[PDB]
Symmetry: C3
Subunit: 186 residues, 3 copies
């Protein structure tokens, strides 16, 4: 079976914008669909949470349990980006340092929230159980491994692993040739 909303159910959600062949679990949470644009051929799985400003392009899988906290600044994924299960992407984060109170029970003037657009460029893949922090551009074709923590921007076409991640090898570009192949045959 599957848990995906109908085309009929989907247009009732109220997305800023939703494309063709979009498959979204009835078990995801979508908060403020008003600020969420989704392109074509996108699958969002069980127990995802998308909240605040989120832009997804086309050909992207958001695997189960993944939370995207877009806040005001937003999270944007370009085409052919994918995110494996249990990832968190934060576009805002509280100050852990001891210099500020923390979290949504507390008025902003006591906190020191860090906020910044998070961008995943084309062909980015994020491995399972990973965390991406605010104000981070994940460069084109970057792979980050499972269980990775990314606190700053990542250079294009590299593979990274660890907490926090380190650059371990080049990502191959064959994928770009297959993109063009795939598209050409449509």
């Amino acid at each position: 079976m599957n848990s995906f909303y109908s085309q009929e159910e989907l247009k009732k959600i109220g997305f800023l914008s939703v494309g063709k062949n979009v498959l979204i679990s009835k078990k995801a949470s979508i908060y403020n669909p008003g600020v969420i644009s989704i392109g074509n051929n996108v699958r969002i799985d069980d127990f995802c949470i998308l909240s605040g400003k989120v832009t997804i392009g086309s050909y992207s899988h958001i695997a189960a349990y993944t939370a995207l906290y877009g806040g005001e600044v937003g999270i944007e994924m370009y085409d052919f980006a994918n995110i494996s299960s249990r990832t968190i992407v934060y576009a805002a984060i509280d100050d852990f340092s001891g210099n500020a109170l923390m979290g949504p029970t507390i008025p902003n003037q006591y906190k020191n929230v860090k906020t910044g657009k998070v961008i995943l460029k084309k062909h980015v893949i994020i491995g399972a159980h990973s965390i991406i922090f605010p104000n981070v551009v994940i460069g084109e074709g970057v792979a980050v491994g499972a269980m990775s923590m990314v606190k700053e921007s990542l250079d294009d076409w590299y593979i990274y692993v660890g907490v926090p991640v380190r650059k371990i090898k080049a990502r191959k570009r064959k994928i770009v040739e297959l993109e063009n192949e795939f598209l050409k045959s449509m």
Copy 2:
């Protein structure tokens, strides 16, 4: 949108005690609520689980996916403690050594469950995707980083990271001041 119970449904859950301005997700799970006590200005998000003895004070966020397995001995959080997404706090665990059978499918006399009260003191923040094992006090003002694992009590006012955690630098104490300033404020 939002997924919270109204103050009216909350009253029907049958909590040991629940204060005001409590926002609990309808997508969270609550088992044995008659041993669960929640103070004022608490938020518990989608997909959290609270099970068995759990005591939360005030000005606390339990972010999404976080499981608090309080068992019979309990987990207690003091005021201004917050737990980030996908954290687990166990007050009991099975013996992994090979010296016992394991899990809820096996009866106790063949197991060797390790149990003990867990306490998160005031101003503790627990980073996302972290695990706290039983019989542990997380010190006053401690921050535990993301993806960290805690098996022992932690000294006050430090930041710890890793699996298992190590101390990396003092937590700043400004928040004590901010706590007074904020509380004055009302």
Copy 3:
């Protein structure tokens, strides 16, 4: 207060096979029950996902949030095997190298999915927040620590930790007697 199906609703799911004393959360997701079999005395908790080909023996707990993506080649667990919360087992994963396109939105010609049966032998325990990848045999009596990642088969009766896992000590085998002793009671 628990969230399990009755034995009656269980039969309405359409498992290849379901034993007795099987406690499955209504909050778990089960996809393609037709290829899933479960033996006796098994508990599957909230927000679990079982997808594709999955075979569970007896006396096994699959804890909250755990995802078993059995695909076509399958995941098998033998008796007395248990998986702690927020674990992922994959029988298939995409190629992260950059030599292929990725994920369920892309046709198979353009991908290079690696596939392989995952087997957990008797008495295996997998710690919370762990990830097991395809084509892996976890030998009998293996314990994998929390927050660990397994890409290769594991030697029987050892304890392994880390990302990727390294062997750290033997598992005790007192478990083997206890099993005999307990089964006698039955």
